[PDB]
Amino acid sequence: NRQASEFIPAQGVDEKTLADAAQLASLADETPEGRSIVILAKQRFNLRERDVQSLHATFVPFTAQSRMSGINIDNRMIRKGSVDAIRRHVEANGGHFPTDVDQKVDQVARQGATPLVVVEGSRVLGVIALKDIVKG
């Protein structure tokens, strides 16, 4: 029961850029956070959505084996996963993640938030830090 609250760009990408890919990687997530992140992009920086139907792209539902999910489309190939899953995915792409942001992911954990990392191509475009919310 966690909702995205703020996200920081990986080095080389603007945070709004991170939010847009944060969305398309999170379209097909069936996790409660999957909706929180797509709303995090709109409220925080940019009310924006996905564009698979215009490019004929494919959604990749989240799997627990990799603990991550994402989307492939004509113009983008982005994923969002736990920092452990995504970081392995960047090196497997042959790409690299920004340590300053992997550290910011670590800071989201110490505050009790869940750092999801989203990548585009083989690199990370930023982390989405999700925070816990109180009901009633």
Short mmCIF file of C-alpha atoms in Angstrom, two decimals:
data_model
loop_
_atom_site.label_atom_id
_atom_site.label_comp_id
_atom_site.label_asym_id
_atom_site.label_seq_id
_atom_site.Cartn_x
_atom_site.Cartn_y
_atom_site.Cartn_z
CA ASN A 1 0.00 0.00 0.00
CA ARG A 2 2.52 2.66 -1.09
CA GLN A 3 2.09 5.61 -3.50
CA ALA A 4 4.74 7.42 -5.58
CA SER A 5 5.53 10.82 -4.02
CA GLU A 6 8.64 12.20 -5.77
CA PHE A 7 11.21 11.05 -8.33
CA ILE A 8 14.77 12.19 -9.15
CA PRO A 9 16.47 11.94 -12.54
CA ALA A 10 19.40 9.64 -13.18
CA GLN A 11 22.39 11.65 -14.39
CA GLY A 12 21.84 12.69 -18.01
CA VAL A 13 18.01 12.87 -17.83
CA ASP A 14 15.62 15.61 -16.60
CA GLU A 15 13.17 14.61 -13.83
CA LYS A 16 10.15 15.27 -16.06
CA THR A 17 11.77 12.97 -18.63
CA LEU A 18 12.05 10.42 -15.79
CA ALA A 19 8.34 10.94 -15.01
CA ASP A 20 7.17 10.26 -18.57
CA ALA A 21 9.11 6.99 -18.78
CA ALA A 22 8.07 6.36 -15.18
CA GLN A 23 4.55 6.32 -16.63
CA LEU A 24 4.95 4.16 -19.74
CA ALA A 25 7.03 1.62 -17.78
CA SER A 26 4.19 1.69 -15.19
CA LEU A 27 1.16 1.40 -17.52
CA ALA A 28 0.87 -2.36 -17.25
CA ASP A 29 1.99 -2.69 -13.61
CA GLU A 30 -0.79 -4.38 -11.66
CA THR A 31 0.71 -3.23 -8.35
CA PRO A 32 -1.11 -0.67 -6.22
CA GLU A 33 1.98 1.52 -6.75
CA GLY A 34 1.59 1.04 -10.53
CA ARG A 35 -1.28 3.55 -10.44
CA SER A 36 0.46 5.73 -7.83
CA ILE A 37 3.49 6.20 -10.12
CA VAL A 38 1.48 7.08 -13.25
CA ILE A 39 -0.36 9.64 -11.11
CA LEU A 40 3.01 10.77 -9.66
CA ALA A 41 4.13 11.86 -13.15
CA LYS A 42 0.97 13.88 -13.79
CA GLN A 43 0.61 15.64 -10.44
CA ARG A 44 4.29 16.24 -9.72
CA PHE A 45 5.62 17.44 -13.08
CA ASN A 46 3.52 16.59 -16.13
CA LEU A 47 -0.06 15.35 -16.56
CA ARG A 48 0.99 12.91 -19.30
CA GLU A 49 0.08 9.35 -20.32
CA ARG A 50 1.23 6.51 -22.58
CA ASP A 51 1.35 6.36 -26.39
CA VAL A 52 1.53 2.64 -27.25
CA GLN A 53 -1.59 2.64 -29.46
CA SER A 54 -0.08 5.36 -31.68
CA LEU A 55 3.23 3.52 -32.14
CA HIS A 56 1.86 -0.03 -31.79
CA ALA A 57 4.05 -0.65 -28.72
CA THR A 58 3.90 -3.58 -26.27
CA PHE A 59 3.31 -3.46 -22.50
CA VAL A 60 5.28 -5.81 -20.23
CA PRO A 61 3.30 -6.69 -17.10
CA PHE A 62 5.22 -6.81 -13.80
CA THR A 63 6.63 -10.22 -12.86
CA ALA A 64 7.66 -11.18 -9.31
CA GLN A 65 10.59 -13.27 -10.60
CA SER A 66 12.38 -10.11 -11.75
CA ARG A 67 10.38 -7.88 -9.40
CA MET A 68 9.93 -5.31 -12.19
CA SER A 69 7.82 -4.28 -15.21
CA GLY A 70 8.07 -1.92 -18.22
CA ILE A 71 7.09 -1.23 -21.84
CA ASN A 72 8.65 -1.34 -25.32
CA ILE A 73 7.52 1.10 -28.02
CA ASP A 74 8.75 2.30 -31.43
CA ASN A 75 10.46 5.36 -29.98
CA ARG A 76 11.22 4.14 -26.43
CA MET A 77 12.30 1.02 -24.53
CA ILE A 78 11.84 1.75 -20.82
CA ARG A 79 11.48 -0.39 -17.69
CA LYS A 80 10.75 0.24 -14.00
CA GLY A 81 11.80 -2.20 -11.27
CA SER A 82 13.36 -2.46 -7.82
CA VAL A 83 16.83 -0.91 -7.94
CA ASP A 84 18.28 -4.42 -7.70
CA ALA A 85 16.30 -5.64 -10.74
CA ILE A 86 16.73 -2.50 -12.85
CA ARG A 87 20.44 -2.11 -12.04
CA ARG A 88 21.01 -5.68 -13.20
CA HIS A 89 18.93 -4.80 -16.28
CA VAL A 90 21.11 -1.76 -17.11
CA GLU A 91 24.34 -3.76 -16.99
CA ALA A 92 22.65 -6.53 -19.02
CA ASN A 93 21.71 -3.92 -21.62
CA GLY A 94 25.37 -2.96 -21.63
CA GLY A 95 24.46 0.38 -20.02
CA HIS A 96 25.09 2.00 -16.61
CA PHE A 97 23.17 3.64 -13.72
CA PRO A 98 24.07 6.93 -12.02
CA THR A 99 25.55 6.36 -8.55
CA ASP A 100 24.26 9.69 -7.26
CA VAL A 101 20.76 8.43 -8.01
CA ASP A 102 21.31 4.89 -6.75
CA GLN A 103 22.38 6.71 -3.58
CA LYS A 104 19.16 8.81 -3.72
CA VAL A 105 17.38 5.45 -4.05
CA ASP A 106 19.15 4.44 -0.84
CA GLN A 107 17.97 7.65 0.84
CA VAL A 108 14.36 6.88 -0.13
CA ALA A 109 14.75 3.51 1.63
CA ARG A 110 16.11 5.11 4.84
CA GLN A 111 13.07 7.40 4.92
CA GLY A 112 10.94 4.26 4.51
CA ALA A 113 10.11 4.92 0.85
CA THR A 114 10.45 2.48 -2.08
CA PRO A 115 12.87 3.60 -4.76
CA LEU A 116 11.82 2.22 -8.14
CA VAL A 117 14.43 2.84 -10.84
CA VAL A 118 13.26 3.46 -14.40
CA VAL A 119 15.58 3.21 -17.39
CA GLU A 120 15.32 4.18 -21.03
CA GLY A 121 17.52 2.38 -23.55
CA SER A 122 20.36 0.82 -21.50
CA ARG A 123 20.70 3.62 -18.93
CA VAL A 124 18.65 4.84 -15.97
CA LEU A 125 16.51 7.94 -16.51
CA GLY A 126 15.74 8.32 -12.80
CA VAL A 127 14.31 6.74 -9.60
CA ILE A 128 10.69 7.03 -8.49
CA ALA A 129 10.66 7.20 -4.69
CA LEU A 130 7.32 6.05 -3.30
CA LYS A 131 6.25 6.89 0.27
CA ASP A 132 3.85 5.26 2.75
CA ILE A 133 0.45 6.92 3.23
CA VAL A 134 -1.93 6.88 6.22
CA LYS A 135 -5.61 5.92 5.83
CA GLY A 136 -8.33 7.78 7.78
#
